[model samples]
Structure formats: structure tokens, C-alpha cells
Target: GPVPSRARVYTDVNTHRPREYWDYESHVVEWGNQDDYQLVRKLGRGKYSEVFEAINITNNEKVVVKILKPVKKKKIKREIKILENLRGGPNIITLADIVKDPVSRTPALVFEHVNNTDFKQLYQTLTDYDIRFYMYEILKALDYCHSMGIMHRDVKPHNVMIDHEHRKLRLIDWGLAEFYHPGQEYNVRVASRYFKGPELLVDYQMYDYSLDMWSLGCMLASMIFRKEPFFHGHDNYDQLVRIAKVLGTEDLYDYIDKYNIELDPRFNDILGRHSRKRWERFVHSENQHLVSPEALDFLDKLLRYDHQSRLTAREAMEHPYFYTVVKD
Candidate 1:
């Protein structure tokens, strides 16, 4: 988990603040007919940006270009800060360069294009040890991030890409990642709904790296069982309900009490609800064979009602399940 050496290249000397805080419209470099770069095709798109595949004309090197949608200056600056702070590891995606979009007055991120498919697609082709190996690599990457005090709010399979040429797993996308201080308070509703941790649903003010572990657990379960995510609810409330169904209402209450956690007043109704027997019935009826002992063990730690009691990324890596099926 050693830090990789990075070369710092300063772009335009504009102000560095959150997009919402910026007042003036900054001019960025526009895409032009550069001699050494050729846009090949579109890769993917997000809520505020689009990605494209480009070839380095000089060396024929492939890269991905993520272009941001024009927004307030603060968001642009925020993204730049996040990307710059995100250090790379074997499992984490590496940022190559950052460019400006003159026409859009935004920024574009250049990354080493991973030529392999994401885990969602890879799961359809690989089985047994291959899947477990991928998960182990992911855990290794998460461990590295945790060591660096970075919390990747998103950890789903779609964000994981395999480098087929090198047979390496790479984590992509850092739009939701943030740096954490031991006792600092930040109000940010990050991460996807289904993979969101219990603290996010109940006490948004007290979430931390444990949130990522919860999502990782969900991702692992989704991959192994090939079933819909356990907490596949559309909104925050429904998501909490899904979690309540699995861990039982009383267990969740005990968790909050044991950890001295406070639930958002809006979600207090879930305090006295218990459904352990109902959860057992549903799992036995719908997903009996899908639950392997390793999966159950991981899930037990992952699905803990208390975020403080959830397994750490490092601990999860040392679990018997990871060692049992992972190769190299």
C-alpha cells in the first residue's frame, strides 16, 4: 500500500473553491485537432459529464476522456480537488492528465483507459475462484484507500474494470469520494441508494468509511447470489425498510443504542419494528441455495446494523472467504 510517485502539472491558475462558491465564469481549454490525440468513440456518461475513448496519435495509446457538463464554478473546482487528492494503487484507477474545455468552460479528466469489461459483465463470464480473486484485489485496493484516509462512497461492480492485457483489477470513478478527518463534520449525501450504509439512512450526520464497507458487502452479495441487491429500494425510506427487513427492527435499535447513535427523527418509526422470522422465511424461500457459509459470514459483518460495528476493509480482506477462494 505504498504511495506511488506522481508528477504535478499545474493547469490554468483559476481559483480553487467548490463550484457553488465560484462567482466568475472561468475559461477552460477547448478540445481541438491536436496532433497526438484522436477521439475514437464515446465510452459512457454520467449526470454531469460524458466519457470518450481517445487514441494517442503518436504512440497509439488508448485513454478515456471524461468531460464535465458546464456547471457552477464550485463543482468544477470540487471535482478537480477530489481527483487531485485521489492517489492511485494497484486496484484504484489512475488519473493521467487534466485538461480544460474552453467551449464549455469546464474541465476534462484524462485517464488510462482500461480495455476490459466491468465486474457486472465479468461476472457473467467467470466463476468460482476468478470472482473471488477479483474481490480480493478490490479489498486490497480499498485497504490502500483506507490507509490514505480516502472514502470511496461508491464501490459497486460497475465502477470496477479489469485490465485484460495485464489481468489486473482496477477501480474507476471517484466522483463520490471524499477525504475524512478523524473528528470533522461534513454534510454530504453521497453514494447510491441500494448500497448505502445504515448510518446514511438513519443518521446522515454521522457517516464515515464504514459506509463504503457496507456498499462493498452489498456488491459482493449481489455478485455471488446473482440476486437483486438486498436493499434494492428506490428512495431513502424504502432503502431503510429493506435493511430493516434483513437485520430486524429490534436488532437495529439495539445497534443504535449500543453505539450511542441517533436516528433521524423522520425514521424513528423503524425503531420498534422486528422481523427476524420474516427475514428467515424470505431468505429460505427465495435465496436458500445462494447463501454460502463464506457469503453468510461476510454478510453478517457487512450487514451489521451499527456502522461502528461493521467490518473494516482490511479485516474483510483477511476473512477466510477471501483467502479460501482467491488465487494470487
Candidate 2:
């Protein structure tokens, strides 16, 4: 267990609001006509849900239908409530409607369909300015959600839907999102492996909105470095090993000591001492176009051992790395 840490920005967001604002489990559901949307095909599948490309029969518009598998009602309500709270936020996914089958009572969340380009190919072709534009858009979504007292625990490229032709982005997937209560111990079981922040890997459950900034940093780094995942860890324990290698063992120790973090013993063998790797070391002829001083400085600030030291979403948006994007 670590000493309590609070977010530098939006610390008292939830406290000021009425208890009902954050009481997601108690929220009542207003189900839409299940027949209004027809599932076209499976888009993707996860542990608890299956996403499908769907068409709204009434409006004749495209949409995404996320069919929830058998799970706790509270969990379903949490996602719905969070989505409702963040409905019109910049770059935040628009939850069009919620529907459920009358027979099975299987819940489904309907969202506005986006012409998203897969990052595997999209990131390969993004210009330097293009990356900046998308990054700024994501920060807007993060900042907006953080200001609303929510943390998007999962903030990876897959969750960011980008319609590059229209220069539009939407931060999707609220399944893991949560209301941030100061000093509240959260499950470190959020976020994807490579995009996970240091705090999660170290079992620092007292993390806040800054955790999203780290995931964003990982996404940005992967784009500039041409690595699918900037941190290639095999498992949970190996995650810290990967991060310590890049951030250096000394700083990792300092962070652990500061928070009284007890790293899993498995790291003892795999995580030997490593010097801090300079950001410049990642640049090469292929990714050189994506590299710049502003970019490196921004990445360094976000990928820190201490979550408190990581750039807040708002701070990152103001960074010079997004000067051009922010101006517009």
C-alpha cells in the first residue's frame, strides 16, 4: 500500500457534485426499442462484450452496437452512466441509445458510427502534424472527462476512433472508465498491457486521471517510434520490467520507495538494472519525420515513474507540441 495521492487537477470535482451525480449503480435505465437497430456484423469482441456494426432502421443511419455479455447489472449501468455524463464532450464517443432484448434481456449500447482507420495502417501514414492534431483531440476528450470527475482507465489507440478524412476523433469504450474520488483505491487491473502506466504495474491503486495521460503517452510514443507497443511486456509483472528498462532502475526504485510500493517478486529476475534511455535513441530514418524537440519533451513528461509528475490532460494540450493543433 502506498501513501495517498490526489490528482493535481480536478481534485474536488466529484465532491462538489450531488451524490447522485456519481452514484452510477442507482441510475435507472431508459431502454430504447431494441428493434430500432439491426446488427450488421461483429466488429470486435472482448471478455464481457461484443461490438457490432449496426444500422438504425428508423433513422437509416449507421451505428455501433455493443452487446454486453452476461455480466453484473452495476457494471452495465456504470458504462451507461459514464457515457451519459460525457455525452457531448469534445472527441468523446456519443452514446446514441441503450437497448435490450425483451426475451434474453441482454443489454446493448448503441453509439454513433465512426469511419475509423485502424491504427496499424493509419499510424503508418500520419504526417507529423496529423499526429499532433489527433493527439490534441484525444487530450480534449481526456480533459473534458477529467473535468467531469471521470477517468478513462483505458486510453489506447484502439479506443480512439479517428476519421482521418474528416479530421475527427472520438475516444471510445467507457467499460473501464470510473468516477474519480480523491484517495479512493482503484483496481490496478485497468488499461491494456503496453499502454498501462507505472502506477498500475506497481499496484498503486490510488491513481487518478493522470493515468490516462500515461496511456496517451504510450500511444504517442508508439507512433513516433514505429513500435506497435512502445513497452513490450509479456505479462503483468513484466510490464514494470519493460518500463523500468526505459525509465531506468534508479528512478523506479525512488518511485517505489516514495510510495512504499511492493513490486511483485517475479520482477527480481527479469528486471535487472537498466540506464535511462534517451528519447533520441528511438528516432531513426523511418520515424524521423515524427520526431521533434517538442514531441520528445512532451513524451518525457508523460512517461514518468511518478504518476503525479505525468502531464495532466489539460497541461499536455497546452504543451508546444500541439501549438498548431491548439491554435485551430
Candidate 3:
């Protein structure tokens, strides 16, 4: 449960927050009427849940039904608790009801519908201002969750729902989210492999809110670099090597040594001495429209090997990358 050198900054973040924000065990979920919702169509699927475009038969309203794949009782409960805690927060996805299949006993979570276009299709069409606009909106939810002492373990462009016409963005999918206890060691297995932070890759737990910033950096990097996933690693072990290829192995080695973590033997051959590559190395004449001095400066700060050195949600909002949208 080692903390980074800059742990002193967040030492008091949870001090003024309520225990209910970080509490898990004491709460009991009141499951709603599953029958009230009708599955309209399949939306998407993941390792944990099958998503459906559903309808509330009782109210005639549209909602997204996130049905947890038959899984552990504790996993379902923890997700329910965190969603309810963050309900009504800025740009946070709203959980309307919790439904369960009677015969199968599978849990289905009801959420407000977002007229969303997938990030793949949507991001391709976004202007530089548009990218900053939604990313700034995403920070609203991240800062709010951190305010409530919660850390969203999974943060990727896919988890962000953007209604481009309405200029609305919601931070969805809290299934991998957890409460932030100052010195707690969490599972290194939380975030998706590509968006996974250095802490998760190094088998270092006890990560804090800064973890989200790293993932945010990854998302922004993709759009700017014109790469769907900025770091396309084949697997978990190569994930670190992929990051090291751009960010440099020396800094990663420094981070591993600083935390006193033992590297996985599989990483031995993959871990070569890579010098830091300039951010503009990703920029070409083709993607030049998306790249800016401010963009590189902001991305450089967040994609650092040390999670402690990354910007906080509030601080990131004030960075020059976001200056264009703050006025509007």
C-alpha cells in the first residue's frame, strides 16, 4: 500500500467528505420492478454486462438497461451503491432503477437515455473546440466523484456518452468505480488494458483520483494523434511497454524503483531503454489540424509516468488546452 511522493496533496481531500460517500458495506439496495422495463433493443456488451436499449412500460420513457452478466452478489451491490451516491452530480450518468429477471435473477440497471453517437464515429467529426468542449464537460463529473471520495477506475472515450448536437456529455459506466480511501491498496486489475494507468500496470495499488487523469490523457491523445487507441498493446504485459515506447522506459524504471515494485519477468525482453519521444512525434502534417502547442503541453503533463505529477480534475480544467472553451 505504497503512496506516491505527492500523496500529501490528497491527504485531506476526503477529510470534509461524508462517510456515506466512501462507505459500502452498511448500505442495502432496494431492487426495483424489473417487469416495469421492456427491452427494446441490444445496445452493446462487455466482459461484465449486456447493455440494452430499453423502455419503461409504465412511464413510456426511454432508458438504457445495463444488465450485469450473472456475477457475484458483492460486485452488483458495490456498483449500485456508487451510482446512487453520485446520482444527480454534474454530467454523471443517472441510474433510474434497478431491475432483476425473476427466473434468471439477473440484475438490470435502468439509466437515463443519452442520444449518444459512439466515440469512434463521433470523435472523427469533432472540431478542436468540440473536443475541448466535451472533455471539459467530462471533468465536471470526475471532479464531482472525487469530491464524494469516489474514484472512477474505468475511464475511456467509450464510457463517455456525447450528444454532439445538444453539446451534452455524460460519464457513464460506474461498474469498475470505487471509493477513495487515502492509503488504501485497490486491485491493480481495475481499468481497461489500454487506458490503464502506470500504477495499475506496475502492480502498484493505493492509486488515487489522479488515475482518472491518466485515462483522460489517453483519450485525448487518441483524438489528437488520430489513433483510435493511442496505445495499442497486445496484452497486459505489453501495455507497459507500449507506454514506455512513447513515455520512455527510463522514467518507468524510475517509477518502478521508487515504488519498490518487482517487474514481471515477461516484461524483461520488452523493456528496452527507450528515450522519451517528443509529443509532436505523434503529429504529422495530416493530423496537424488537431495538434496545438497547448494541446501537447496539457497532454504532456497528464501522461506522465508518475501519477502523482498529473493534474487534478480542477487543475486540468484550468490548463491552456481548455482555455478556448472556458470563455464560451
Candidate 4:
């Protein structure tokens, strides 16, 4: 419980804002004409939706067709409204339109197509500078959303689209995103296991924008450390054990006690002692090019088990990791 108040960054920014400002449940989707588009090819699949490369017959343009699976109608609206509000925000994906199957009435969202190179392949090709450059760009999107009272619950590389040739990056998948209200208890079921914050892995419910900082740190760790999954936990419970091994069980206990969090009964048997591993232990000849004092310090600030101590999106952008690589 060594954690303090909400993250110093944007703590009070959303405090006085009207609840309706972040309210997506009150909105309705204005369906678009689906006949104007034709499916080109399958792009990917997700837990909640299927993605496709499609063409807009009206303009003969390439666009992404995201077909929402059978989910609650409110969730569909939440994503739609988030995109609507963030349409012009920097690095945020553009939602082109909304449509549905005529008979099934299954809603689908159309987003702008990104000619992305898969991160697994792309990360291998990137230099230290490319990693820092794109990391900076994603932070711009993060800061913009956090400033808008939104927390992108999912912040893994899979959700990021990188047009490497054009140097374009977009933060996609607002399906898991939600507005961060002060003192609000959010669903811990959000975020992929590899990128889930400690608050979610443990049962700490009152998290804020800082949650994304933790994920961003994990993403950066994987990139620089060359570990596909910075934390290779077999399941959610084991996930914390994976993190505690790296971040230390002592700090985890301190955080749990500081917040008076009830240690999930699942962790009782599995929670044993683990000393914090030095970040340098992860460094080696292949990834050494990305490992600098600046990078280590930056990662240290972000991977904090206590969400409040992690760097804000805004603060992370200012870190020296990007100082030399970032043009602006």
C-alpha cells in the first residue's frame, strides 16, 4: 500500500467533467449502408470481433471492416461512441462507418485500413531508433485519450497498427477501453494476459489511466528485451507470479497491504518468495543495442507494480529514451 493517490498525471483532469461527457451508453449508432462496401480479404480475428480488408465501392477505397461478434449491444455502442469522440485525436484509428447484416442484424464497424507490418516481423526489422520513434507516437494517442477521460484497457502490441513504410502508427481496439472516473472500480477482466497490469491480475479494482502505463511498459520491455512475452505466465494467477518474479514479491505484498487488497485465495498457495530480478539480467548480445541506461530507467518507472508510481503517457513521452531518436 506504499501507493499514493491516483497517478499525479491527469488525476484531477477528469474530476470536474460531466459524467455525460464520458458516457457512451446514452448514444445510438447511425447505421451506414453496407451495400457500398465489399469484403476484400480477412485481416485478423479477435475475441469480440472479426477484421477484414474491404473496399468502399463508393470511392473505390480500401477500408477495414470489423464485424462485431454476438456481444452486448451496449459494448458495440461504447466502441462506436469512443471512436466518434476520438475521431480527430492523434494516432487514434478512424472509424469510417457502422453497418449490420440485414437479416441477422449483427452490427459491424468500418475502420480505416492500415497497411501494417505484423509486430513480430516488424520488431525484428526495426533498429533502436525505430522502436523509440513508434513508442513516442503511441504515447501521443495515449495522452490524448487519458486527457479525454478515457483509459485504453488494452495496450498490447497486437492492438497497435504500424505502417512502417509510411511511419504511421494507430492505437486500435477501443472495445476494451472505458472512461476513467475518479474512484471508479473498473472491470479487471480487461487487457490481454501478457500485457495486463498488476491491478487487474490481482483484485485491485480502482485503477485509472496508470493501468495503460503498465501495459506500455510491458510492450516496451518485450521489444527491447527481445522477449515475446515479457511476462510468460501460464494463466492469470501464474501471471502475477511471473510479474512478481521480475518486480519482486515484497513490493507486491507492500502494494497489496498499502491498498488493503484481499489477496485472492488463488494466490495463497502459489504466492511464494521471489527476489526482484535486475533488468540488466534480461540484456544480452542481440538486444544490447536497445539496452541503454535511459531505456532501463524508463522501463523501471513504467513497470511498477503500484499503478500510481508508473509514468503517465505524457511523462513517458518526455523520457530520455526518445530524446535522441524523436525529432520533435
Candidate 5:
């Protein structure tokens, strides 16, 4: 079905913007001198970019330098423009400069350095209260960006950089982020597979900001359930199967029927019927401290098969799970 769906909120945001505002392909990026920063060490590399810890020679401040690998010129501009649009938003990564290597024409984006702790270790040490505190921080970033007409297609634990000592959180990696235009078809190939939403696995392109909420839900589910990835799928098609197993195959069929989505032929043999698995089933003695009625309630709202059924980032911040954090 070619049925189009707009985000429940912020639907007209981009429509109100000037054409030049959301038009990234035609925008000219003002490149900074790459010599201004020096690489200190490697941070990590994704398919699109290589990240590093660096120092800004001009100001003698530590920074992150993301060296983008070869890609379409338009893709690079889209990321930069979105970052510029989201600048100064709560918990959003601060972009310092956009630089390019003269000899090879390699582009690098400079950002404020976050003294980050790996979530693998960090999530293990977090108290139940700490989980609410930082998850609330992540919400601030998501809400801020969504309010500005952007959807962070990628939202996962690795992309959330937390500085426990400073009690800081920054949503990094804008590479997969995009400007949300109502009723527009986006590439289903956006988010990481494990955190991918049902809309993506079903080839539904008219997804909106609610996509991030699903990813955020997956992140929260992993932390509370003590699984690195709550949905361990072997591939993209299997990703939906994994989610269907827990959320139930019946609901998946309902979502597909509501949207008139065409199931990919690959799913014909693999997708069988299953009943919904309750959130309480995930609570174990090891993670009981992290599990509670409010926590499960909040997770339920965020993880829905229908994109429109998921809670908005703003709504999620106000959930009962964050009652303590919001009180503070």
C-alpha cells in the first residue's frame, strides 16, 4: 500500500520552514581548516565515518573529530545541515566545525568532546534511579530534535554517550538522522537492525519521529532485561520475526493490515503465529530492582508495532517511570 502517514505531532514543522532551510543537497557547507585540530586517538568507526579524540589547537580544548568515509556529496550535506539545525538543543552533540583535508578532499566534522563511559560497563553499574535519570536525559535530546522537525533514525545505546562523573548525556552520530517531512517516504535502511522499528522491517517508508521512540524503548528494554540487545536478530527480515516473537505475531499482522503493508516474500515461510509476551516475564531476580510497574508501563508505550501508537518523546519524558526524575 502507498498509504501515507504523518507523525502524530510535529507534522507541519518542516512545512513551515523556508525551502532553503530543509534543502541540504543544494546547500554549500563552509569548510573549516583541518589543521586547526589534531587527532589524539581513535574513538570508533562506523560505515559512514571514523571518529577520533582530538584537540583544538586554537583553543587548546579536547574535541571529537569524525572523519567521514567516501559517500555521496548530498549525504554529507544532509548530516551537516541537520546538525546545524539542531544546534544548541538539549543534550544534542555540539558541532564545533566542519573541516576538509586539502590533498584528499576528506571531510571531518569537529564536535565537543564527551568524556564517555561504555554503556556495556556503565549500564551494569547504574542503580534503578540512575537508569531513570539518564533515560530522561536521552528523552530531552529526542524531544528537542523532534520538535525541530528532525528524526534521529539511529537511536541506540552506542550512540548515547554518557559521562557519569559529570552526569552528562549527549546524543551523537547524526549521520542517519533526517529532516521529517509529513507524508514523505524515507529510506527503510536507516536505523541499526536490532533497534529498527516494525515499520522499517515491513518496508513502510512513511514512518515519522515515533521511530526513535521504538529505538529508545529497545535501549531501555535491554538495560532492564540485562540483554545487550533485547531483540537478537540475525538479519533484517529476522529482526521483525524476533520482535514479533515478543510483541506477538498477531499484533504484527494487525499493524500490517492497518497500513495495508505488503509483506516481503522472505517472510512467508518464517513468520508464524505467536502470542504476546508480557513485560513481567522479563523481570528476573537479577534485574528485579530495575523492574517495576511504572517502568514496564513506560516501556509498553514506547514499543508499539504501529508508528503512531508509540509515545512521543515529550510524552515519554512525562511518563510515570520518570516521576522521580521529573520531581527533581
Candidate 6:
């Protein structure tokens, strides 16, 4: 399918009168410059923003300062709305506050500083039991998000944070999170390539919350096997081939037909180049004994080639794999 040439836009119609646009250059300012927070350490950097650890002077609480690049009024307002709608639980990162940039005229999100490390780092020190426990917490979080009608488009291991001392896991990074209403149409592609659902790859513009389940499954496999679920190529063409290698080309036909998907010429050339039998062999060759039967059972419901066949996060929480680890 051809990419849309025009960027999508929406209007704010809740007010009685038309809203006035704030001149970013004149109105925006640095938030913490004169505030009492001490910068601790640099957490991470992105194309448009940077995160840093800061200590609150009054309460001495550690918080993450997420600074967005100077953005348009619509984007700033949208991000604010997203943050406002976010609710916190043990499994989801807590948002402390939203600070406005005084100088750059941008916005920043202040979040609780979760101890321990992300799942990618936790993999280095995981036992069978540890994996089970972490996955249970992760599913709980995903279940909560889905219940609230929100979809976390991105669900990579790096976004899964852990507190080793307490054996707690939390999902972070809401940059790609969005609300999904029933009967609403959505974009076909919205998440990272390696963790995207089959429908996303097959050009399905309208999808439900099942996509996150697919990512969760891929993340679980990656954690246990210490490798990505699918071998990613340099571009989308290579990605489709890698996907076909795992799930047969014939299996994708139903989705293509249902969504009326049109694949690029490059995609058709590499389709069906490999079979599921070969894919299984690859899985067995690498870390075959890492996951237990219970984990595999959960993976089966999540990693289906058909998105509609995938389990919802709420349904997955009731599975035996999760029940085994559920205790008061």
C-alpha cells in the first residue's frame, strides 16, 4: 500500500469558541531551571527528546525528566492528554507530574524512578522461576491497559522494567500508546517492526487490541531464548520474508484477502521462501530448553500467524501459565 502523502490532523471541538494558539517561542520556558530539582544522571536520548534522573529538593524523591523537543501546539496538547489519561499500578510506570518547558516551550513528563533494570538487562540473571514471575507481572500490566481501552503499540523487553529486590515488573514508554474504541479504524503500522502483529504486516488498517499480545509473545520468546523472536532485516522487504520463514506464506493469504492488502513487488519476491518446519528447527537449535511447557502454552495463544486468532491480554491472564504463579 502507498503511504499517505498528507499527515493526519484533528480538531479540538469541546470548547464553546475557537481556541487561540500559543506562540511557542514567546510562551515556552524551561521548567526545572529555577526549580529545586538536582540533575542526577542521563537516562536516555531519542531523536526529539532526552530523559534524565533528577532529585526533588523538597521531598528528595527521584524522578525521570522526559523532555520533548520543541513541538507544535497540537502535539504538545495531545501528549498532555495522553499523560493525563494514564493511570498507575504496580505493573505500570507511575507518572508523577507533567512539567512545561519554560525556555524551549516544550513539555516534560516527571515519572517515578523505578529501581533495578529493564527486562533486557534482567535476562542476564534470570532463572526459570524468575522468568515465570516476571511474565506474570507483565501480563497483569498488559491486562490492565487493555481493560482501560488503551493499546500499548510498543511492547519490547526494554520497555519492561523490573525491581529485583521486590520481584516486581512494570511496563513503561507510552510514546506509542493510544486509546482504541470499538468499531474504530486505526493505522495498519504503528509499532516496532520486530514486535508487530501479523495483521500489521499484512496491511490491516483496522485492528483490535490483539496486536499487543503478539508483541508480548515475541518478547517472552526473546527473553527465554536470549534472541529476537524474528531475525530482522535491513528493510521491510526483508522483514516480510523473515516473517514468512516463521509463519508460512499460505497462512498469510487469509489476512491479505480479508484486508485487501497490496504488497510491494519486493515483498512478493521473498514470500514463501522458507517453511514453518525450517523455522522450528531454528528455534530448537537455539536455546531449545529455555522455556517450560507452561510458557510455550501461553506463547501459542499470542504468537499466532492470524491476528484475530491471537489471545487478548485479559484472556491470557486466566491461562494456566499465569494461574500457576498467582498467589496471595
The C-alpha stretches of model 3 lying farther than 4 A from their native spots are 1-19, 326-328
Whichever of 2 and 4 has more lDDT, that candidate is 2
TM-scores of the models, in the given order? 0.79, 0.97, 0.94, 0.95, 0.97, 0.83
Query: Candidate 6, residue 306: CA error in Å?
Result: 2.2
Misplaced by over 4 Å in model 6 are: 1-36, 278-289
- Residue 75's lDDT within candidate 2 is 86
For this target, which candidate reaches the highest lDDT against the unseen true structure?
5
Shift of residue 137 alpha carbon in model 6, Å = 1.0
Per-residue error (Å), model 3, residue 130: 0.6
Runs of candidate 2 with Cα error greater than 4 angstroms are 102-104
Q: Kindly give the number of clashing pairs for every candidate.
A: 8, 0, 0, 2, 0, 7
Clash pairs for candidate 6: 28-102, 28-105, 29-101, 29-102, 29-103, 30-102, 30-103
State the lDDT of candidate 1 residue by residue for 99-206, as single tens digits: 675655667777887878655566666665666677788888877766655678887877888875577888778877655544445454777788878776765454
lDDT of 4 by residue, 76-181 (tens): 7788878888898999999999998664468888889899999889988888888889989999999999988788999999889999989999999999888776
List model 5 lDDT by residue over 32-102, tens digit each: 88899999999787777788899999999999998889899889999999999999999999998999956
lDDT of each: 0.67, 0.90, 0.85, 0.87, 0.91, 0.66
Comparing 3 with 6 on lDDT, the higher-scoring candidate is 3
lDDT order, best first, reads: 5, 2, 4, 3, 1, 6
Q: Cα lDDT for residue 225, model 2?
A: 86
The alpha-carbon deviation from the true structure for residue 35 of candidate 2, after best TM-score superposition, in angstroms, is 1.4
